[PDB]
Enzyme design. Structure first.
Site, mmCIF file in Angstrom:
data_model
loop_
_atom_site.group_PDB
_atom_site.id
_atom_site.type_symbol
_atom_site.label_atom_id
_atom_site.label_comp_id
_atom_site.label_asym_id
_atom_site.label_seq_id
_atom_site.Cartn_x
_atom_site.Cartn_y
_atom_site.Cartn_z
ATOM 1 N N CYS A 160 11.632 -23.888 -35.873
ATOM 2 C CA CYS A 160 10.662 -24.762 -36.558
ATOM 3 C C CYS A 160 9.515 -24.123 -37.205
ATOM 4 O O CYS A 160 8.879 -24.776 -37.965
ATOM 5 C CB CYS A 160 9.940 -25.740 -35.642
ATOM 6 S SG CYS A 160 10.889 -26.453 -34.416
ATOM 7 N N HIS A 296 1.207 -29.427 -35.861
ATOM 8 C CA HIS A 296 2.633 -29.398 -35.724
ATOM 9 C C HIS A 296 3.093 -30.854 -35.570
ATOM 10 O O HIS A 296 4.023 -31.305 -36.225
ATOM 11 C CB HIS A 296 2.993 -28.533 -34.491
ATOM 12 C CG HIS A 296 4.445 -28.385 -34.264
ATOM 13 N ND1 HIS A 296 5.307 -27.914 -35.234
ATOM 14 C CD2 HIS A 296 5.226 -28.675 -33.191
ATOM 15 C CE1 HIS A 296 6.559 -27.977 -34.789
ATOM 16 N NE2 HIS A 296 6.527 -28.403 -33.546
ATOM 17 N N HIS A 336 10.562 -34.300 -39.345
ATOM 18 C CA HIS A 336 10.454 -32.880 -39.027
ATOM 19 C C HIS A 336 11.446 -32.140 -39.893
ATOM 20 O O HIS A 336 12.656 -32.236 -39.712
ATOM 21 C CB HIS A 336 10.796 -32.693 -37.533
ATOM 22 C CG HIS A 336 10.529 -31.319 -37.007
ATOM 23 N ND1 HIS A 336 10.613 -30.173 -37.778
ATOM 24 C CD2 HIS A 336 10.182 -30.908 -35.753
ATOM 25 C CE1 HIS A 336 10.347 -29.117 -37.017
ATOM 26 N NE2 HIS A 336 10.069 -29.543 -35.789
#
Lengths: 561, 561
Positions: A160, A296, A336
């Site tokens: 990520c 995040h 995401h």
């Protein structure tokens, strides 16, 4: 002041809901969620979440532009294809002809999407070529080779947080003098269209397909797909050259959580704390000067409180000021985006700073009761907010915490007329593409929210776009007239527009050098027949500025196994 | 002097023909080719299609390692199910990372300031799993993502420096090495792990030689030879541990060689095609590395070439080296040239590390190992009167004042080039060897490895240093045995007793839990076998040195779809 800074000078993205970064920023300002809500077992499963956040046209490409054969185009996964397209566009967004900026590094990240597995068993010379085209290093290197770039070129991945490793690599290469520019790209594009998922115990995925970052209702993440590339440049050089700068990147750092946590897939407050602290120490930027943090911000039950706990622990070391710094997450809008997550965050930050406004974080009603915003530095930025004039430039931070524990934090800073007629030279590889260019440019003139400077627009097409074989020049006094001429061109009413076909470039001669209106028409006619004119001649006493404008209109042909 | 240097302190590798880096060096010194050629019989068993067997252009060769499928998931608390979801590159790089740190004489959790850089191929392993499988879909997807490799290493070893995957096709390992160099020399980390592995997810014996592939007509890599007509692949895995040079020296580490500088570039557009080599790109990266190190080319004694054995590549490689070195010197025949690809094939992401390890071990042993499959110079290359000779024999590196230096090149497909310059760097019985492992079966295997080592070592082994290495350079685990010995032959006898079950004279500990002159030694030993964290600092007036010794004997259990 800018020795340790890097300017963001070009952007190109394709994210859920948004075909380009200007549309993206609009959608963020307005609070828009681009997740789309809609096989019998799944349909009937009460835990199936009928949601998908993707881009369209994963299969569309223009291989002829890059001299790639139709066969090889099919061997190319969509991440490779779209990162190439977006790399080309990011440099044009900045107002540069790629082959004129060889001192550029290239960093790319993408998923393992198993694309090559889709090809015919017999296929898998084709076996070797398709294997090469499936290796991760082929992405950045293909960019370097096709754009004419000579700096270091390689693929980077940390799950990520990958985009931010790309950004770190760019920061290091540029600040050290290794390169003047860098491209940073990320794309996670699955090799299937798979609508929805089944919500269940063993996975920290949202119960309803929404990311609810920082909210009481936050019960897991949700994925999205997209592609983005940005162009960075040595800050002092960008300023000197008069570039269109979205924002400055002032510093960035990485670490890994190591073993100090319970499990490989878990988050870590200590790792987050330490990377934030590391970036504050390297930049020497005081936390009181940060106005906004792009988190995040995944919307997991355990991750959101951990993220705020780490920020609060660190900022407490420096200040007791309250409610001065906003917090949000673009994952609320688009999911995401995996390898592209950090760049979606970066692009949000850069545009916020550029427009002197925060965009809201969405899917938020009430604060997670485990998180104590009250009396901390931080508020959840759930509305638009103007960034007030003040003496210190506004700063904004960005976090990305990867699965496997590689953490990144970065700090960004805000950075802050001719006479008609204007000459807009357009060119593309063939007539169909050129017509598409005119159509793009016309749509841009109509859709732009504000008035568009033709002085700057013309200069951008003059000096910021590679001169190709099919050519047209539009000489115009104002936007409405320019648009009228573009529409005439689009419709085939071509009669009064200077045009060139199969044009071959040449150096201007002494003879060619032997009123201002007459002269302008003459330069234009030289250019349409291929002469590499010095567009500087147009500007003895005006100073046009390159701007963000429509980029090459790639063909949209389908390649898929 | 060493401010801009990094020490190579640990190595672990598994390459065609060689189970470890000591056996690898032996094989290189002896000129062994480890490519396997198969008879007609041998092809039929192993079941290769009779239509391949009958094809006169089929080349019946394979250069691989054994046991790609073998792993010890219990050691890392990985479930058997998850172990199957892990591709062999991920598995072997984890194993080799563990081993490289032990090879250096360090307990990995005691060196948290360590960066991790890994490279590996896209081998389509996940595609092998069942369709139903592809919570399993997501976990196996995660485990297939490239960033999982270095982050799994960081997590399992206890490492907290930056951790990420890098790739630039065949030059990948050198991008890894570059990343390590930068991270350590900048003070970001004290150590770094650099790994590479290209392990295919199939066993595919041989290939069909054909036009439009640049692959050897007979399966041999014939680097720099008149008969060179293409490359050939190999598979392997390697990881090395690097360390800040001054700190390695201060700590008394076992240093194979120093890395003094390294650089990268990309060929860009200035060549005929994506897949072609580039004399300009090579020239420029070599020049960049000379300028950053300020090392004069007359001080370089050996170059480990990219050395692929292609008809166009080999002459391009020498032309670039000649053109650069001409600007510094007219001296002739003082620098050897060779390629490890002649021994084991082109190891793709691990090609650079195979080269590095050859260079490091050459410098450490003060000897050049021959390049093989070489009879006569390619007539397009002019070695005569140049600096360079083909190093087709063993050669002793003479005593001289300036340390010997050796360079290394790796030129990737897609044009990312790397060049690096390396430099040579130069108690009384009884002894206590405390061995430990996770269970009794592993402990026995450890004793067996250690006994084999004592027998196979070419030179005498210092028990003083060996014992110190097991005392201070290996994590104390739950199954424990202590061997108190005066000399190597007695030690070996006790190990053999233990291996055979005759262990009534050996102090042992089972399920040990850690907790806070002859007489004293025996006393420490008994404390340690019951778990006391004794201070092995036995050494009031001797100074033992950590050495390269057998590392953890992982279980060899099969996991494959």
């Amino acid at each position: 002041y800018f020795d340790d800074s890097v300017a963001i000078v070009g952007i190109s993205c394709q994210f859920p809901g948004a075909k380009n970064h200007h549309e993206f920023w609009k959608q963020l300002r307005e609070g828009k969620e681009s997740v789309r809500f809609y096989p019998e077992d799944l349909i009937e499963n009460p835990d199936y979440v009928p949601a998908l956040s993707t881009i369209e046209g994963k299969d569309l490409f223009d291989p002829e532009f890059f001299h790639i054969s139709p066969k090889d185009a099919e061997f190319m996964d969509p991440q490779l294809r779209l990162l190439l397209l977006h790399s080309w566009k990011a440099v044009e967004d900045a107002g540069y002809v790629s082959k004129e900026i060889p001192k550029t590094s290239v960093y790319m990240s993408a998923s393992n999407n198993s694309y090559r597995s889709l090809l015919p068993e017999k296929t898998t010379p084709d076996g070797y070529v398709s294997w090469v085209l499936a290796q991760s290093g082929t992405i950045p290197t293909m960019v370097s080779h096709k754009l004419g770039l000579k700096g270091p070129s390689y693929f980077v991945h940390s799950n990520c947080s990958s985009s931010l490793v790309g950004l770190y690599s760019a920061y290091k290469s540029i600040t050290s003098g290794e390169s003047e520019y860098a491209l940073v790209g990320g794309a996670t594009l699955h090799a299937a269209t798979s609508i929805g998922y089944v919500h269940q115990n063993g996975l920290n995925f949202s119960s309803d397909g929404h990311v609810k970052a920082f909210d009481a209702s936050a019960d897991g993440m949700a994925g999205g797909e997209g592609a983005a590339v940005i162009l960075l440049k040595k800050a002092s050089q960008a300023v000197q050259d008069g570039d269109h700068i979205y924002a400055m990147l002032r510093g960035i750092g990485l670490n890994n959580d190591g073993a100090d946590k319970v499990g490989f897939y878990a988050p870590s407050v200590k790792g987050q704390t330490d990377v934030i602290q590391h970036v504050l120490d390297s930049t020497n930027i005081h936390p009181e000067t940060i106005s906004y943090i792009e988190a995040h911000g995944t919307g997991t039950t355990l991750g959101d409180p951990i993220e705020m706990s780490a920020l609060q622990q660190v900022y407490k070391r420096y200040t007791d000021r309250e409610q001065y710094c906003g917090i949000g997450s673009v994952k609320t809008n688009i999911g995401h985006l995996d390898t592209a997550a950090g760049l979606a965050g970066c692009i949000k930050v850069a545009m916020s700073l550029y427009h002197r406004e925060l965009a809201p974080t969405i899917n938020y009603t009430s604060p997670n009761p485990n998180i104590k915003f009250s009396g901390s530095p931080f508020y959840v930025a759930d509305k638009r907010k103007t960034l007030p004039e003040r003496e210190t430039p506004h700063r904004a931070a960005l976090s990305s915490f990867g699965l496997g524990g590689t953490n990144a934090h970065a700090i960004f800073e805000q950075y802050e007329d001719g006479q008609p007629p204007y000459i807009v030279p357009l060119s593309a590889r063939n007539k169909q593409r050129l017509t598409a260019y005119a159509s793009c440019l016309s749509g841009f003139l109509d859709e732009a929210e504000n008035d568009v400077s033709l002085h700057d627009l013309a200069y951008t097409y003059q000096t910021g776009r590679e001169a190709m074989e099919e050519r047209a020049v539009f000489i115009s006094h104002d936007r409405h007239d320019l648009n009228r001429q573009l529409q005439d061109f689009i419709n085939g009413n071509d009669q009064n527009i200077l045009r060139g076909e199969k044009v071959r470039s040449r150096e201007v001669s002494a003879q060619e050098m032997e009123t201002r209106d007459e002269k302008l028409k003459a330069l234009a006619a030289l250019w349409v027949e291929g002469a590499r004119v010095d567009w500087g001649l147009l500007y003895p006493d005006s100073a046009p500025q390159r701007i963000s404008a429509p980029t090459y209109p790639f063909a949209e042909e389908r390649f898929w196994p």
